Amino acid sequence: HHHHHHMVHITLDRNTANSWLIISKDRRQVRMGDTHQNVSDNKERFSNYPMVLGAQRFSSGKMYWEVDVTQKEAWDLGVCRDSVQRKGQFSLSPENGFWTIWLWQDSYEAGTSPQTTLHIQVPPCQIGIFVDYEAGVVSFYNITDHGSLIYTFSECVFAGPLRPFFNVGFNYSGGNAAPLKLCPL
Ligand SMILES: C[C@]1(O)C[C@@H](Nc2ncccc2F)C1
């Protein structure tokens, strides 16, 4: 790719975080805590899963950011509608307003309905996410493998403003405590 020159400074929105997440002072890192984090509930918070949104809202243009997934067993990354469901159980699909990929149990998959198998030669330590609002495109790039394409959603029905989306995953195993980190441009 050559998408680095549409780079945007993403920060995490504390108010949308699941109440077990810990967001760094600079709002660039998030991890799963071992307990509920002494914050009030609100209607924005994701209740069932360890999810958080970016503070930035996008309704036009080309946006690019990179996330460090080093030493994680499980995560979800991408973008979602500002209007996505926050409470109870839901699937990650374009029908529900999510354009995402994930790692789960040693397999990488795109959040289609049903999910699509990804083919990645070099397990990524850093992921690039590119959104072209006008084109209706969300693409994922493997920064560890010279920016090689992972997956492209096209003809996307954004149907409103978009927010960066993150899931740090559960830590039942004790092997998934590592943070998601937004990487410097
Ligand atoms: C228990 C902790 O607070 C330390 C750990 N941090 C990291 N672990 C793995 C890769 C990168 C990290 F920054 C989460």
From Swiss-Prot:
This is E3 ubiquitin-protein ligase TRIM21. Disulfide bonds: none annotated. It comes from Mus musculus. Autoubiquitinated; does not lead to its proteasomal degradation. Deubiquitinated by USP4; leading to its stabilization. Autoubiquitinated. Homotrimer. Component of a SCF(SKP2)-like complex containing CUL1, SKP1, TRIM21 and SKP2. Interacts with CALR, CUL1, FBXW11, HSPA5, IKBKB, IRF3, SKP1 and VCP. Interacts with SKP2; the interaction with SKP2 does not depend on an intact F-box domain. Interacts (via N-terminus and C-terminus) with DCP2 (via N-terminus and C-terminus). Interacts (via C-terminus) with IRF8 (via C-terminus). Interacts with ULK1, BECN1 and with ATG8 family members, including GABARAP, GABARAPL1, GABARAPL2 and MAP1LC3C/LC3C. Interacts with TRIM21 and SQSTM1/sequestosome 1. Interacts with IRF3. It is found in: Cytoplasm; Cytoplasmic vesicle, Autophagosome; Nucleus; Cytoplasm, P-body. Induction: Up-regulated by IFN. It comes from the Eukaryota. E3 ubiquitin-protein ligase whose activity is dependent on E2 enzymes, UBE2D1, UBE2D2, UBE2E1 and UBE2E2. Forms a ubiquitin ligase complex in cooperation with the E2 UBE2D2 that is used not only for the ubiquitination of USP4 and IKBKB but also for its self-ubiquitination. Component of cullin-RING-based SCF (SKP1-CUL1-F-box protein) E3 ubiquitin-protein ligase complexes such as SCF(SKP2)-like complexes. A TRIM21-containing SCF(SKP2)-like complex is shown to mediate ubiquitination of CDKN1B ('Thr-187' phosphorylated-form), thereby promoting its degradation by the proteasome.
